[model samples]
Target: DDDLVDAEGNLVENGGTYYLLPHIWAHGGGIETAKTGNEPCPLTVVRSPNEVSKGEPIRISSQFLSLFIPRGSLVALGFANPPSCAASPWWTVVDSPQGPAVKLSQQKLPEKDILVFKFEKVSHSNIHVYKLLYCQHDEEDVKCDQYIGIHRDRNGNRRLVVTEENPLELVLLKAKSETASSH
Candidate 1:
């Protein structure tokens, strides 16, 4: 085993552990190193047949990043007992100032009846977060100061925090399928 590039740009003929750090910006402190059994922060979106379905109870879980999820690694958008995954927490794709937002609601609820969380598109990365606030009507309106940031705790387990919310995560799935035409 030889002729490999190390963490540095220089090429080395020996093999060793190469650690790659995440790029940090602004106030810094984005990259975190720990021994968490779950995948690291910036969890990507998982694609499936019914991943993005309208008027269906959807669970926001990552294919890799399954941590801090004591309750089956599923994100509970609503405070419903057993969550919406069992009840009837339906979601709809709506146009927002940020971009396409997934509006959560009940089975037979109207459009304006309920507004759970709005998924905001962060710049520089594909990883995005659902806004803590109900909704942002204005384009220039500033929502929650801290977002639902995902990181590892002292025990080295994946945990969701508020401060460490920065830099979008890497999403490996497409929001919607692209249509193909006959050549």
Candidate 2:
């Protein structure tokens, strides 16, 4: 029973059901799956349903994220999807001036990059909150991990982005077991 704790505390197990709400509730509702660009490629971020009047909060999983293991990525499992959205729900974090912005990737197979996320407990004993880390690797060749935090724009919009500072303290509210329960 304790081995699944990730040696920190009760960590996110693979394929678990959970929705992310901003640590500060007023920040926004939660993360949602969104479509942008000319095509329907989905890009996910921290947002509120009340604001959009569309879309739903995203249920996510840290399927392949292991401190000791390799190969895996964070993912946005499902949402109000259209037919054109055929790609895998794996999350993507690419580095830039205001990046490693966390977004959705098309597929995890064809792309030979490692985009593993870590649910690092801010401090195990005192608090149970977590700060997500973006751990993208290249041949395990060099260490290039960053903190997954919020990127705020001038208009006071906040979205999840990986950067040096401003990590989002996420509260992982359990969403029942993975098996479908019905009457």
Candidate 3:
């Protein structure tokens, strides 16, 4: 006995069969599904390989969703695997602005403003996964709400299997930075 709705509560049906779709919350922004079919996580914040430089500043925004995420909200990009690290992956969050807005570094860092999420190109030759995370500031406490990224489960190969209990995925694309660029 299981439900077949995605994380965002979207019904997913393929052919005559039904499957489970993961759920990833956006903390203050609400919830969304990574996506189904050939499309990568529709909610994945992408950064093309050539579009940004390591150590450069970066920010995220959705083309179809508005995450009015405030400071203290964390965005867990994904599991930092292999050469990246050997731990269970770190979480990235928005921090106090030095000027007006929270800025993230292209390179993963251990700072409040800097994010541990590093965007990489997604391709057949080079594959990667990320558990995107976000947290919103709570005036009542230092802690904030947590969220994860969801994805499609096709075949038995689908990793990041989220239930009513578990959650988060990774992929990079040509994304327009919210602070800069016009794409």
What are the models' TM-scores? 0.26, 0.62, 0.22
Q: lDDT per residue, candidate 3, 86-123, as tens digits?
A: 13222234322211111223355554333322222212
**Best model number under lDDT:** 2
Query: Over the full model, what C-alpha lDDT does candidate 3 score relative to the true structure?
Result: 0.27
For model 2, state the Cα shift of residue 119 in Å.
1.3
Candidate that would win on TM-score: 2
The best-first sequence of candidates by lDDT reads 2, 1, 3
lDDT of 1: 0.27
Better of 1 and 3 by TM-score: 1
Give a tens-digit lDDT track for model 1, residues 92-142: 334434333333322454433333233333345332211332333356533
lDDT of each: 0.27, 0.50, 0.27
The lowest-lDDT stretch of 10 consecutive residues in candidate 1 is 12-21
Rank by TM-score, highest first. 2, 1, 3
Candidate 2, residues 97-122: lDDT per residue as tens digits?
65466655555533333335655555
Pairs of residues clashing in candidate 2:
none
